[PDB]
């Protein structure tokens, strides 16, 4: 078994559901912005959902990002964003503001906080009927306040479970994407390329996935996934020493499971 840096890690084969790998795999830990993966699940999930529907980007969620010193994609206020685009925004440079923009969207309520909080309660609800346990958010994006934990093998069926939508597949193997939105005035603009930050996409063969995490007591963190010869691993590493240790250890586990 190999050695990992990280508190807690898990890892099992996609297709069979098999553990492969296990570390404090069911000890509760912040999430920090991996929370954002339930997000995009959530959202895919909804029946009236419009890949294609335009958002308008609020003040609202500008100064979230500021007030909660939070990753974000730089959405300019006045600007219309499609769902998609905001998926994008949301999983690649895990765009905080993008979640706010989602929740806001949609949560069920005749306001914005009523939205918000409908939202959360969905993403409760998904951990709760995926017969998950460990697992619970008070925040939409795992940086706002309150209650954010899970577990390494909570995680990753959560994971797996946003793995089987094709918008989320695609979107979380782009390294990466350039939005093109509507500005308040109709022009369009063209944003600054947005980056994928998990960096195994390019360093390791055959990476898929899915999304880092990071927060002031999510430190750093990765769920990962991997397809070598019709096998796929995925998994969760949570609370590494540094990026390098993170990937390290991902790589790690990854090896370990595709030799078995």
Same mark, same amino acid.
């Given at each position: 078994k190999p050695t990992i840096a990280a508190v807690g890690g898990y890892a099992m084969?996609?297709?069979? +559901?098999?553990? &492969?790998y296990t570390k404090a795999a069911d000890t509760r830990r912040s999430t920090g912005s991996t929370t954002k993966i339930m997000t995009a699940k959530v959202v895919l999930a909804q029946?009236?959902?419009? &890949?294609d529907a335009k958002v308008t980007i609020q003040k609202a969620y500008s100064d979230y990002v500021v007030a909660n010193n939070a990753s974000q994609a730089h959405l300019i206020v006045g600007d219309k964003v499609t769902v998609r685009q905001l998926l994008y925004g949301l999983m690649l440079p895990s765009g905080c503001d993008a979640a706010y923009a989602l929740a806001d969207k949609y949560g069920? +309520?005749?306001?914005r906080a009523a939205r918000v909080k409908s939202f959360i309660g969905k993403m409760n609800t998904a951990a709760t009927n995926l017969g998950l346990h460990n697992t619970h958010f008070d925040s939409f994006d795992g940086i706002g306040n309150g209650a954010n934990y899970s577990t390494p093998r909570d995680l990753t069926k959560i994971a797996s479970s946003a793995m089987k939508n094709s918008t989320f597949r695609t979107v979380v193997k782009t390294k990466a994407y350039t939005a093109k939105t509507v500005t308040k005035t109709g022009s369009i603009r063209t944003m600054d390329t947005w980056k994928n930050?998990? +960096? &195994? &996409?390019?360093?390791?063969?055959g990476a898929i996935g899915v999304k880092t995490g990071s927060g002031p007591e999510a430190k750093y963190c990765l769920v990962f996934a991997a397809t070598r010869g019709g096998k796929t691993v995925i998994g969760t590493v949570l609370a590494s020493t540094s990026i390098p240790a993170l990937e390290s250890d991902a790589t790690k586990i990854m090896n370990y499971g595709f030799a078995l």
């Open positions: 084969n996609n297709g069979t +559901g098999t553990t &492969l029946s009236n959902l419009n &890949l069920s +309520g005749s306001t930050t998990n +960096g &195994l &996409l390019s360093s390791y063969s």
